Amino acid sequence: DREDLVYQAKLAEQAERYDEMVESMKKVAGMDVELTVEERNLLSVAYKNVIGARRASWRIISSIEQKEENKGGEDKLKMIREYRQMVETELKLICCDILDVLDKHLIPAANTGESKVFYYKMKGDYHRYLAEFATGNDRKEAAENSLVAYKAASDIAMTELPPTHPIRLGLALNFSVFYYEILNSPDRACRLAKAAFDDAIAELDTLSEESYKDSTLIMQLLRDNLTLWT
């Protein structure tokens, strides 16, 4: 039945019906056993699509809002703000759903270094997504929760995974975005990304046959951000 859910999740993924893909993978998480690499990946892809659609909508509506602040059309701005708020409600609901799954099911049952890093990093990501649109105390709390999770993932990654491991590199990449975009700290973002890239370069003998393309891609993205940030 676990095998059946995974199949259903793969069919939903092919059909691009990511809500159903989330439904199926959340049931697998609901089983309180260590997920396979395949299952972790399917769950992560499902929520990143579901949340990504709303993050993309939110950025569009926000940019429309900013244009109109310059034209000062107030009837328009009332409708744009109400629309944005509706999308923020969905963003909050989706983040809260996977954060619950992580706290109740995935993290407690994770028993490998790789899975622990993967799930704390996911925790880091979803609080960071809450922080993207939050203001005032909600933003401070999301930022503090994101930081705690990313630090937890980093402690484990530093002791358990080689510096070329794609989950470790993916962690460095996203934690560096966190410092840049949420904490407004280009200096710390640059340091973290540069250190992760250099530490990988120092140990390229650790690249795995299973994941060298994935490692190579994240390292290119670390470099691409360093470019963007300098």
Partner: peptide
């Protein structure tokens, strides 16, 4: 506008 970890 920064790049975070991709999916697919």
């Amino acid at each position: 506008r920064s790049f975070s970890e991709p999916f697919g």
